[PDB]
Amino acid sequence: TRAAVTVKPDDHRYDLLARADNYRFVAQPEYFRLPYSTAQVVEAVSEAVAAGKRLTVRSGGHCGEAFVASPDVDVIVDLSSMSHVGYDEERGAFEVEAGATVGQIYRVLYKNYGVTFPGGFCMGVGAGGHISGGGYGPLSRLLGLTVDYLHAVEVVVVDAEGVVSTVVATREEDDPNRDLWWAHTGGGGGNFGVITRYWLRSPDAVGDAPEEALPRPPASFHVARVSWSWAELTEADYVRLVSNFLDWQLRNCTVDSPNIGLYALLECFHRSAGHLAMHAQIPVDVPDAEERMSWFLAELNEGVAVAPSLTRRRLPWLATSQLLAIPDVGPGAIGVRRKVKSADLRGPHTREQLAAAYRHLSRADYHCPSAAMEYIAYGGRVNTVDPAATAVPRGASLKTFYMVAWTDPDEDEEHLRWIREIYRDIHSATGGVPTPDEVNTGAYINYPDIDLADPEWNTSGVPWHTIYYGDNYPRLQEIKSRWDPRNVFRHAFSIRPR
């Protein structure tokens, strides 16, 4: 029963609320509204619609682009005081308010019930944007995607006459709003309405105890953390190491691999970081787990002159996950300007692509220790659901991620140049982007990159929405037109009505 908070520019809170994970994008709304209940979210939306104010929602503030914080946004509804996480006995499902962050969700579900779901590895990421986009992370090979556990979603929606209401859309075959549910299984945030809460549960959960409503993770993991110095690293070294990584991953990316429990992430930093790094984990209860880690690490070095430094240890699951998570505070999180890009794979990068990568990663006229591209193990259980049943593209065996991070606004041009040119040269056979084909599956909507709609950087002729949604876009457009006929919810990459 606390009234919703309104923060105008004369309130000291305004400048803080204007800043989220990417300091490139400082919001300047008329006001921020912090509601405490779904009813208050309806009130906020209804006010903005009545006066034609442009409204966007913020949950965790992790957007890679200015979708929330665009200068033309008049009202930001910030859901960070709606962060409740708990078992909803009536639905047999864990209720997660949109303002809950992934770090907090995991701690609560694990300690109280012993359960988890396969969401990302960054602590401050909001449920609101994360889940609707097709959340994944380190347990996805074993458990699938977050949306594989999406039982129901509560959404504040706006009809053609501007009347604002709340609907609960569920997974059930007879649900008349099942289309709205489907759109939230990969359609991405900022598109259909304000998500106020999600409900999560295994579709085949046994009984009705919470301890059975979501999967139990493996109890403990063998963890390896590895690094290769840049000092003596040569193009030959780099290209063989990455090719060995992709080789091994592509042989081991299905539920049939006895190595499917093994997850690894290869972080190819720019030379100025001093090392390439990898982390890997495998559950203790996999047949011959410790040796499987050894086999994998051996194959990696086979044909590589740089010997990696290597630390190996055993940890409980939640510690493993926290050890690898990205902090939401400290110099890596706060006051940081960023640019991210994304491209997903179902076959290897060629020798030529990797040498192109090398040129930019080894470039000595550039200095940015945070500049990197990453190769992220994927597949497994992600790829054995019926793909039609959710909106997220499936078929990638492996994900790639590029990022640069800096603090000085004066260096914007060089960091943006660096990342744009590396991504372009890697995809220079396919118009500078990962056009869905035999090798590329496209890109991930939770790492949006407006350069994909920029004819200077995308010369492929393939539109941004095909890269992010494949064949699912026309269905998303139909649902959008049904549920947001006035196009209240929009941004540079929002689903365009027909």
Add this chain to the structure above:
Amino acid sequence: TRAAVTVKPDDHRYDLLARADNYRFVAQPEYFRLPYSTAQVVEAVSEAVAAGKRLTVRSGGHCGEAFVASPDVDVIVDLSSMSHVGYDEERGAFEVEAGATVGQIYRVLYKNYGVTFPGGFCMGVGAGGHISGGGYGPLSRLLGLTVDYLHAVEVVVVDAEGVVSTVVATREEDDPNRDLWWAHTGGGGGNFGVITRYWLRSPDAVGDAPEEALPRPPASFHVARVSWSWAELTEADYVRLVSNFLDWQLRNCTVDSPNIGLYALLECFHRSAGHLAMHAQIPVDVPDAEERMSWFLAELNEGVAVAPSLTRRRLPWLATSQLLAIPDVGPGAIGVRRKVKSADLRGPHTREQLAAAYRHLSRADYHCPSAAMEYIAYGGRVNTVDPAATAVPRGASLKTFYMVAWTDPDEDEEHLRWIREIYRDIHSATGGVPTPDEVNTGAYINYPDIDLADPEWNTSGVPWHTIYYGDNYPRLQEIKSRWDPRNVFRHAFSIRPR
């Protein structure tokens, strides 16, 4: 309420619960109990008391010693599921459950009400251990200590016949249980009973809106982050630089100073880290704030050959707090073995003390980039209260902290040896410890060091409890004897009964 959770070794959660911030201490109780309400805490305690079991409580798990996780502890009550933070209209105060962490508390208080209290800069620290010890942090010069806002505390206590009850003790002069309240304003955790929740408010708050019930921090700060290269450092530069810092701080540590708003921390890492580092901040609204920071930075450099690297920027308060905060995840936070020590000053270290420090900080036969001593600005508003009114020692102008962090158990001996020897040598004129005198004021109970009770390291004849509690120890023993007559709550540094 959901029934309290019981976790025995057959549950996958047990190995996770056994580990907290310091991996040197792995607990092995009969069970962990995770209660959800005061009544469930009473029940947990009443069980343990009945059968004579040794019980300890964990909130955030940041204890620097094995007070919670001793091998002889039979039951650990983990309060991490009691983390509510909210305004309590009936008391006109903010209610904070013991298991709320400080990072969380700040975010809730600030975004919802625009207020804060001066607690520490580490994200995962639990209210439960933190407040009762006299928590401080970067705003303490301006706002005082956390315990300067302690309106009331709810504690589960055990009488002489072993009957368990709950009491609320308040700061009001006529409160029959004001002694219990006073004990929680510096007496420290694990002593008097199980703290279930705290209430916070300014003693002179206007009216009863929550926006007035705690102080508003400054809206924004100028921040300076400085580093000096170890490759360029000599002994004489080190001695002069630290001397410059101490002199400036000791001229500027009272509320009378026009620089009182400037807070700075100097981290003197071991050579293997590659640099000394300092962060400083001053509110933007202080008269001539930007210039005051320049004046300060110039004084540090006078007579010092090494030029430091420096970045300066302006940030909102919560952002500057988060920029400097220590993460609760990532490699620095998880799976780490640690040893900490503490020494507080009201006068400067001598030149010989500083060359003794240089000797251990440049020692090339040691390697640990996490090893450091720190000098932490303090005083101001902390020292303008009636000191009798709380249990915390007051009088320090400046705090110092020593830490070594590592991961391999094989290295324990050399890290423990390094921190013990540096601290002993720095304090060799006073038997290896900061005996309260004209320069030392003692040490902080929230960085406990069992070496102060070890006659091999403490040769001063001054007992651990004098060093941590000043002259307040016998009054605390009297309160202990009244409120925990059976000595149910104890650990190596617990208040001993009269």
